[PDB]
Amino acid sequence: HKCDITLQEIIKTLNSLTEQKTLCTELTVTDIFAASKNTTEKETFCRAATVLRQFYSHHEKDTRCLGATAQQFHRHKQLIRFLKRLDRNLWGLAGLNSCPVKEANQSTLENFLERLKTIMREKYSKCSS
Numbered sequence: 042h043k044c045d046i047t048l049q050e051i052i053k054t055l056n057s058l059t060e061q062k063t064l065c066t067e068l069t070v071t072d073i074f075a076a077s078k079n080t081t082e083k084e085t086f087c088r089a090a091t092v093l094r095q096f097y098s099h100h101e102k103d104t105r106c107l108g109a110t111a112q113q114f115h116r117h118k119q120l121i122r123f124l125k126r127l128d129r130n131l132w133g134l135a136g137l138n139s140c141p142v143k144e145a146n147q148s149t150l151e152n153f154l155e156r157l158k159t160i161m162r163e164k165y166s167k168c169s170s
Contacts, residue, residue: 047130048134055154064113071142073092075148076144084135087135097121097122
């Protein structure tokens with residue numbers, strides 16, 4: 042149908058993490074892509090959003106990539122802060138806000154951004170008719 046400003050923004054945020062992905066990549070997140078997820082992109086985004094939440098928000102600490110060097114710490118906050126934008130603003134790009142799940146496969150946050158990125162890439166391209 043068309044593209045909204047919202048997704049162009051999203052793709053910018055995803056982008057600017059992909060280019061600064063290294064120390065706190067890899068980390069294990071819910072694999073919301075490996076169970077007959079051939080449902081709507083919007084659902085994938087709903088269900089994907091929740092995991093980004095538990096990511097940026099649960100972590101905000103847990104030492105888990107904090108990197109020790111007060112310096113590396115600044116990056117931690119940086120990603121987590123943007124990931125917050127993405128969380129709060131994935132809801133807008135998704136539409137829905139009721140999509141629990143129960144994926145008990147696991148994947149990486151490296152792959153989470155890839156597999157997230159792809160679906161916006163997909164949905165942003167085929168924006169038109």
